[PDB]
Ligand binder design. Structure first.
Ligand SMILES: *[C@@H]1O[C@H](CO)[C@@H](O[C@@H]2O[C@H](CO)[C@@H](O[C@@H]3O[C@H](CO[C@H]4O[C@H](CO)[C@@H](O)[C@H](O)[C@@H]4O)[C@@H](O)[C@H](O[C@H]4O[C@H](CO)[C@@H](O)[C@H](O)[C@@H]4O)[C@@H]3O)[C@H](O)[C@H]2NC(C)=O)[C@H](O)[C@H]1NC(C)=O
Ligand SMILES: *[C@@H]1O[C@H](CO)[C@@H](O[C@@H]2O[C@H](CO)[C@@H](O[C@@H]3O[C@H](CO[C@H]4O[C@H](CO)[C@@H](O)[C@H](O)[C@@H]4O)[C@@H](O)[C@H](O[C@H]4O[C@H](CO)[C@@H](O)[C@H](O)[C@@H]4O)[C@@H]3O)[C@H](O)[C@H]2NC(C)=O)[C@H](O)[C@H]1NC(C)=O
Ligand SMILES: *[C@@H]1O[C@H](CO)[C@@H](O[C@@H]2O[C@H](CO)[C@@H](O[C@@H]3O[C@H](CO)[C@@H](O)[C@H](O[C@H]4O[C@H](CO)[C@@H](O)[C@H](O)[C@@H]4O)[C@@H]3O)[C@H](O)[C@H]2NC(C)=O)[C@H](O)[C@H]1NC(C)=O
Ligand SMILES: *[C@@H]1O[C@H](CO)[C@@H](O[C@@H]2O[C@H](CO)[C@@H](O[C@@H]3O[C@H](CO)[C@@H](O)[C@H](O[C@H]4O[C@H](CO)[C@@H](O)[C@H](O)[C@@H]4O)[C@@H]3O)[C@H](O)[C@H]2NC(C)=O)[C@H](O)[C@H]1NC(C)=O
Ligand SMILES: *[C@@H]1O[C@H](CO)[C@@H](O[C@@H]2O[C@H](CO)[C@@H](O[C@@H]3O[C@H](CO)[C@@H](O)[C@H](O)[C@@H]3O)[C@H](O)[C@H]2NC(C)=O)[C@H](O)[C@H]1NC(C)=O
Ligand SMILES: *[C@@H]1O[C@H](CO)[C@@H](O[C@@H]2O[C@H](CO)[C@@H](O[C@@H]3O[C@H](CO)[C@@H](O)[C@H](O)[C@@H]3O)[C@H](O)[C@H]2NC(C)=O)[C@H](O)[C@H]1NC(C)=O
Ligand SMILES: *[C@@H]1O[C@H](CO)[C@@H](O[C@@H]2O[C@H](CO)[C@@H](O)[C@H](O)[C@H]2NC(C)=O)[C@H](O)[C@H]1NC(C)=O
Ligand SMILES: *[C@@H]1O[C@H](CO)[C@@H](O[C@@H]2O[C@H](CO)[C@@H](O)[C@H](O)[C@H]2NC(C)=O)[C@H](O)[C@H]1NC(C)=O
Ligand SMILES: *[C@@H]1O[C@H](CO)[C@@H](O[C@@H]2O[C@H](CO)[C@@H](O)[C@H](O)[C@H]2NC(C)=O)[C@H](O)[C@H]1NC(C)=O
Ligand SMILES: *[C@@H]1O[C@H](CO)[C@@H](O[C@@H]2O[C@H](CO)[C@@H](O)[C@H](O)[C@H]2NC(C)=O)[C@H](O)[C@H]1NC(C)=O
Ligand code: LHK
Ligand code: LHK
Ligand code: NAG
Ligand code: NAG
Ligand code: NAG
Ligand code: NAG
Ligand code: CA
Ligand code: CA
Ligand code: CL
Ligand code: CL
Ligand code: ZN
Ligand code: ZN
Ligand code: ZN
Ligand code: ZN
Lengths: 696, 696
């Protein structure tokens, strides 16, 4: 029998291991020859595995690279202009890779060039609230200062935007052991911790969903019009560079001025964590100098797109996509995900060779230039937007399969909650102590829902990954899943060796998943989701789950507003329309569910009518005018946080209208805009509800 | 048998006559009680006629009305400030209506209030080229002048926008006998010509597709956020008022300054047509004073929406819509169209009562507040945009059925050309001399295609009517048809009594269509189109017809650019990408057509897949970012002309980038934008082509 069990059983941990090894022996930096060669390899293998067609889709997009003969570095400079300390020019390479060529040294992708000299101000995590505390409470002025910020808590691009608006003339990012060194664990290569010479690479753009900075709205094809750099989207205006904690200690140890305002500002280094500005009296004349010489350059990138044609509904697309480009070896990010995709394709191809085809078309994608701003996924979606918005059923992302070995993590649209619950009840837990128990059981035990007993936690989608164009721009139901750490065991996000040279095959094989059982579990979750979405006769979405969360989000946004009761009285700010729309959505979704379960099962038109209602329900939350000043974030329920691209925000339009409103100089204008966003949200919720009404 | 012949045969000229009489006895001004009562009557009758549901959809939108106790008028004022001449306060009412109440006096809807006094400048038709001739050639400065412009050639809102940008402080619009008095025809009531006391009403907004000025993007429902007046869309900044030619003669006769530049500037009045500024020497101290006291007010409007559920594809909508509100009696505009719709509903309802249902759902609409800026259609489409863009097959408009008695006029998407040709071959010509011949034959003879022998002329859709939101904002295949005059017999557009009190039932019954045979023919064309669109198994669109016109439009826009060969060399301006996309569209459309004719006819999924490809093809020409500064004009192939809302422009983005480019101060910026619009157009054409490729 060709059923999901046949698909799932075919997946092998040993295959995922072999693919991971294969994908992580050399660097695959976007825009480089090595990453083009891997694209061609993937294309060849997906054909071999049995997909109907496999093509490369290429684009020419703005990328950013250090100058090989003019290295980036930071100095402490004395009053004579002598550089008395210099940060590293490279991370010490790990055992057995000390002769690997083409390792890109640590840099902040898209930094402008410059050599700013000045006094240091320490800004904690450079969050919105961190700058609020400096400027408003501590009365420290960052204008013309170089800021030093620790990585963590929020996307680094938001840190740089915040530093820029504070008037900084440069940003130094560093990894504090507080956030990247788990107590009791040894540094790579003897454990999974970040060594003091390790550095986190990463782009510092603020694209807000635009894709290639030079071609917002349109694919960066051969005849594309490209904005001039000065009009490009999302580029930082001040130089930025990342360093490790050995180097950070040297920059921070001399810092004077004001003491840290409290303990939440102190990391784990043996330094005061003084905010500055500048150094203590003996060193008061020493300054910090950055030297950044990186260049932005239009460069060709290559997505691999594989198609497995649907037998019944070939014009309905279920997409499994993740990126292939890495900063260096990509041992976790992204190759732990790409190896999983590779095995999923191989398994589907095995069934196909035995004569099976899924009901709907499955598209498989190996995206390029993700590390430089989700560029490959976004340019492809811009090219294919009309096909995706009329035919796109769902998008399942496939970046890193692991960031820990504790339990499952799922972030997805409410439309997929029931699908996820049901699938995980059918899968075996790989966890020790849960032998013979379901993944649902271990996941629920280790990651309980904060709201419901006997349910697991499922989070909203944020952003910072390749689902962004599909979900927040185009309104295609999206999901992601991976294995994660125990947040009770160290509160820091992600894994210590993130975006460092130390993220290698050996890191995974030795420390994260020796038996590749967590990889296999994640292949089963991602592949199982794709299988159901593509094969079920009724799409496996439950509209009633959206009704429940809409009420939760309406309560939450109302509660934020109600911290300002006088203003709500003065400006007649009512949430009645939003609650009414949510009530209506709940009622209509309930009746739709009845019809779906009750309709004449022999009638393919009623079924498809009803499958189209399910498919277009996520689409209904799209506002074609976008959110304020963010035209590519069009989903009215979910946007990436304006303060942290990684985090999702609910009712983002109303959230941003309320944020820091007490500080607005024209309260009438400000509360007027709150009311406008309530109207837009209520209307959108009612309009989405009405797509589930009887059609005529 | 229930086939199109049964539907067509049921339509009766005598019924259309009875409905026209019924709809034209009292004024039905938008926002008035009389127009609400007619809405309720229509709703009742459509229910009686047999539709499944008939509801009122209401909105509260900005309308504009004169002040009943503070009349609008224009004066000539002497140096003492004595008003020595005053324009009429009302049009002399026609025979037997001299006691009808609630006739709105002539005014320009949405004029601001004011009493500007100044010297007159005569600006011909106030077209872009007319102001070019004044400012550039004649060196006449309109700043601080009151401009007087004759109606005709272009939409009056464009005249007012042009006057505003020329620095005018007021606009007087008048009907010149050259444009509104056919030689050899007597004035109403003894013929169909405009009498000297007749005046054309009409709104002077520049909405660019926005709908209600206060709620762009969102329906003007009960909880709507409304912009303040100062931020409203499309409102004129200077006072405006319309007059008849008896009054115009008094304002023009004294005009001095420069002579008219040539004969194209002279109308038919016994006056010099001097451009001014101001009056001849003896009257040089006399000035013109406007008195405008109209008020803008948010007012409730009511659309009637009738549904006839489809038997097979209830979630596919074919819409027949036209407006119901009139300026006064609406004898032609709109009731000659509304009576036709009423009879079409009655005929469909007759078939339904005998057990028939169309394959797809038919929606019937009686729109309100069309005369005030397409407000009812636009607000309803804003409310229902998600349903319309995923389910909307086609929109057939139904304003005035007649503007003459000579031949058929059709404006529509290329997708409907074949449908129209085939249907008109099946219909009888009502024309004298063409007894027993088809409508196709008489139409082709009287209105030959400028391009193809043996074919009739079919024009592009422009705007100024209720299809605008459906076609140019949402990308739903749209069409319209009416009987029209012979352009060889008088070149003036429209009919002389347009938007005057004299547009009555008697005008139609006596002078235009005594036997209601032209009305019946138009009911057959509009109803027949709806019947096919709603009932055929394969949608009756031919994608190959779009390929032919795309090549025509590409040639045309290229030819415009090629008037600047040096600049095309300097800035490397190539149209190669657009021609490539058009070639590709042609090739892919040809292969799609083969599959449509060749596919397995027993397979409803392949059929619907292919019906969805046909339905979404118009949709593919939509750009979600809209055209420059016109966010609600989203169709890349067709937009209303930036110089004349009534006219359609092809490749509008490139057209406007090229328009008057030789006058731009930064040719590099200007030609860069031409190249950007070529990229956008080429991409959109290729993307639309790719929706017709095999789906997987
Ligand atoms: C959640 O779902 C419910 C439906 O169960 C929607 O309820 C509608 O709510 C609006 C109010 O926002 C009601 O609007 C009112 O309509 C009255 C006329 O309604 C009749 O006629 C219409 C057609 O014109 C029919 O569709 C309808 O069935 C009724 O027969 C108006 O007279 C009301 O205006 C008067 O009162 C208001 C308030 O005091 C004044 O501001 C006005 O000046 C005026 O005096 C009003 O417009 C609507 O009728 C309800 N429809 C129903 C029950 O079917 C909710 O709107 C929906 N929530 C959201 C957010 O959409
Ligand atoms: C009308 O329809 C035709 C298809 O019949 C489209 O043709 C494509 O045209 C583009 C040019 O605009 C071609 O682009 C070229 O692709 C080359 C690689 O193509 C191969 O590999 C890709 C996957 O990466 C496959 O899809 C493809 O089948 C080929 O096997 C590049 O190497 C070319 O770049 C080089 O030359 C250019 C020009 O000198 C330089 O600027 C570059 O720096 C580089 O040196 C180029 O990108 C594309 O291959 C064609 N596809 C075909 C024939 O299938 C038209 O684009 C389409 N019209 C529009 C407007 O869309
Ligand atoms: C996750 O799994 C849960 C549990 O299986 C699943 O919910 C269940 O779905 C089934 C299938 O729709 C529901 O069964 C229906 O129940 C109603 C009322 O009892 C019946 O009227 C339905 O009968 C009709 O349809 C049948 C085919 O399913 C026909 O055989 C029959 O003739 C009728 O036409 C039907 O049996 C069941 O009630 C729920 N259980 C719950 C909610 O507890 C859920 O759908 C899964 N989630 C997915 C797939 O996303
Ligand atoms: C306007 O009217 C014209 C003239 O009628 C019409 O064009 C015609 O359409 C028919 C129907 O598609 C075409 O007939 C087809 O021709 C090809 C080649 O000869 C055949 O392969 C097709 O046969 C298949 O389909 C048949 C059902 O239609 C099956 O019976 C058969 O088994 C095959 O599956 C088919 O006969 C005809 O060629 C054109 N004539 C032209 C273009 O001159 C046009 O479509 C109408 N426009 C509309 C409806 O918008
Ligand atoms: C990762 O795995 C891939 C796939 O197994 C490896 O690529 C494959 O490498 C072999 C040996 O280089 C290639 O076979 C050889 O082909 C050449 C020319 O066609 C010829 O000399 C011989 O016929 C020989 O068999 C094979 O083509 C190639 N497969 C691809 C790319 O599809 C790759 O080596 C592995 N990478 C690492 C780091 O282990
Ligand atoms: C245009 O045609 C409509 C429809 O025929 C006319 O409206 C109809 O008018 C009659 C007479 O006023 C109404 O019948 C009457 O109803 C009232 C109360 O229900 C009652 O006194 C009697 O039972 C009587 O039969 C009828 O309801 C009404 N139909 C509608 C509106 O649906 C209208 O008079 C015509 N207008 C003109 C200008 O001719
Ligand atoms: C990268 O840095 C190198 C080294 O400074 C630059 O190469 C120099 O370019 C200048 C002109 O700008 C020449 O006069 C020197 O001879 C070059 N030096 C060497 C060592 O080659 C190069 O411009 C930079 N590359 C970029 C900006 O991509
Ligand atoms: C930090 O690096 C800089 C640049 O390489 C070093 O300064 C250079 O030293 C050489 C040799 O003494 C001089 O000829 C250059 O003029 C210097 N360049 C600059 C920009 O200062 C510096 O010695 C290094 N500091 C440490 C502590 O190693
Ligand atoms: C329409 O014009 C009338 C007549 O001038 C206005 O009514 C007057 O309003 C003023 C206050 O603005 C009163 O003092 C007068 O007593 C009113 N006169 C009469 C004759 O009623 C009215 O304001 C205007 N209506 C509008 C603006 O809608
Ligand atoms: C044009 O209309 C104006 C306004 O009605 C007339 O001027 C008014 O005349 C009365 C009576 O003589 C005066 O009391 C008012 O003060 C005047 N108002 C203004 C604004 O001037 C004028 O007489 C009319 N002109 C003609 C030729 O009939
Ligand atoms: O440009 C963007 O939006 C983000 C690109 C890139 N995304 S990412 O966070 O590294 N990708 C992954 C990292 C991981 O797979 O662990 C995630 O979503 O967790 C980054 O943050 O540098
Ligand atoms: O606001 C608008 O866009 C136009 C509203 C209104 N349209 S209209 O030209 O009068 N409608 C008709 C007039 C007619 O049916 O003769 C048309 O399309 O020809 C007008 O021009 O005043
Ligand atoms: C910070 O300093 C700069 C001048 O060096 C000044 O423009 C800015 O207003 C200052 N910020 C404060 C104190 O608000
Ligand atoms: C793997 O699991 C064990 C058991 O909790 C844990 O001690 C170890 O830290 C985990 N490894 C990683 C890399 O999280
Ligand atoms: C027209 O006159 C006004 C001043 O009355 C002036 O601002 C404007 O520039 C003039 N236009 C010309 C002559 O270009
Ligand atoms: C009706 O047709 C006749 C014949 O051409 C023509 O003389 C007359 O002017 C027409 N009436 C109108 C209102 O166009
Ligand atoms: Ca782009
Ligand atoms: Ca609106
Ligand atoms: Cl992921
Ligand atoms: Cl019309
Ligand atoms: Zn990644
Ligand atoms: Zn990454
Ligand atoms: Zn009209
Ligand atoms: Zn009109």
């Amino acid at each position: 029998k060709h059923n999901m069990k046949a698909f799932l059983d075919e997946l092998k941990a040993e295959n995922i291991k072999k693919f991971l090894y294969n994908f992580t022996q050399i660097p695959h930096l976007a825009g480089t020859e090595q990453n083009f060669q891997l694209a061609k390899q993937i294309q060849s293998q997906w054909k071999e595995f049995g997909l109907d067609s496999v093509e490369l889709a290429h684009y020419d997009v703005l990328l950013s690279y250090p100058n090989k003969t003019h290295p980036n570095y930071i100095s402490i400079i004395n009053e004579d202009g002598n550089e008395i300390f210099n940060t590293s020019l490279f991370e010490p390479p790990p055992p057995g890779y000390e002769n690997v060529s083409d390792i890109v040294p640590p840099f902040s992708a898209f930094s402008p060039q410059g050599m700013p000299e000045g006094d240091l101000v320490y800004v904690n995590y450079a969050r919105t609230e961190d700058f609020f505390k400096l400027e408003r409470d501590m009365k420290i002025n960052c204008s013309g200062k170089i800021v030093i910020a620790r990585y963590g808590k929020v996307f680094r691009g938001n840190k740089v935007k915040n530093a820029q608006l504070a008037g900084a003339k440069g940003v130094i990012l560093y990894s504090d052991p507080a956030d990247y060194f788990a107590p009791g664990v040894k540094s790579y290569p003897d454990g999974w911790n970040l060594p003091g010479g390790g550095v986190q690479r990463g782009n510092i753009l603020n694209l807000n969903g635009a894709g290639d900075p030079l071609t917002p709205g349109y694919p960066a094809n051969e005849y594309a019009y490209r904005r001039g750099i000065a009009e490009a989207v999302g580029l930082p205006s001040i130089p930025v560079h990342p360093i490790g904690y050995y180097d950070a200690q040297k920059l921070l140890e001399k810092m004077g001025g004001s003491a840290p305002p409290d303990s939440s500002w102190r990391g784990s280094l043996k330094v005061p964590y003084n905010v500055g500005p500048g150094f203590t009296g003996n060193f008061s004349t020493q300054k910090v100098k950055m030297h950044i010489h990186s260049t932005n350059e239009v460069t060709r990138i290559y997505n691999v797109i594989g198609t497995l044609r649907g037998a019944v509904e070939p014009d309905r697309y279920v997409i499994l996509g993740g990126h292939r480009d890495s900063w260096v070896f990509g041992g976790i990010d992204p190759q732990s995900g790409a190896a999983v995709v590779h095995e999923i394709v191989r398994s589907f191809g095995t069934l196909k060779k035995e004569g099976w085809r899924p009901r709907r078309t499955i598209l498989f994608a190996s995206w390029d230039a993700m590390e430089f701003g989700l560029l490959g996924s976004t340019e492809w979606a811009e090219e294919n937007s009309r096909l995706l918005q009329e035919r796109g059923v769902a998008y399942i992302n496939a970046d890193s399969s692991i960031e820990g070995n504790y339990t499952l993590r799922v972030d997805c649209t409410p439309l997929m909650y029931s699908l996820v619950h049901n699938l995980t009840k059918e899968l075996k837990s790989p966890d020790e102590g849960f032998e013979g128990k379901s993944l649902y059981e271990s996941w629920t035990k280790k990651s309980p829902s904060p709201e419901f007993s006997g349910m697991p936690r499922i989070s909203k989608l944020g952003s910072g990954n390749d689902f962004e164009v599909f979900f927040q721009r185009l309104g295609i139901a999206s999901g992601r899943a991976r294995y994660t750490k125990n947040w009770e065991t160290n509160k820091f996000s992600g894994y210590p060796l993130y975006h460092s040279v130390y993220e290698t095959y050996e890191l995974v094989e030795k420390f994260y998943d020796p038996m590749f059982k967590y990889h296999l579990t994640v292949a089963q979750v991602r592949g199982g989701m794709v299988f159901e979405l593509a094969n079920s006769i009724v799409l496996p979405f439950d509209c009633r789950d959206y009704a429940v969360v809409l009420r939760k989000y309406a309560d939450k946004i109302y509660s934020i507003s109600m911290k300002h009761p006088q203003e709500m009285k003065t400006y007649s700010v009512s949430f009645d329309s939003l609650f009414s729309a949510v009530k209506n959505f709940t009622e209509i979704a309930s009746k739709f569910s009845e019809r779906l379960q009750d309709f004449d099962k022999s009638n393919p038109i009623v079924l498809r009518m009803m499958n189209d209602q399910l498919m277009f329900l996520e689409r209904a939350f799209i506002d074609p005018l976008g959110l304020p000043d963010r035209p590519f974030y069009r989903h009215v329920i979910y946007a990436p946080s304006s303060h942290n691209k990684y985090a999702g925000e609910s009712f983002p339009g109303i959230y941003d209208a309320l944020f820091d409103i007490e500080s607005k100089v024209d309260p009438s204008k400000a509360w007027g805009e709150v009311k406008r966003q309530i109207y837009v949200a209520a209307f959108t919720v009612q309009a989405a509800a009405e797509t589930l009404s009887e059609v005529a």
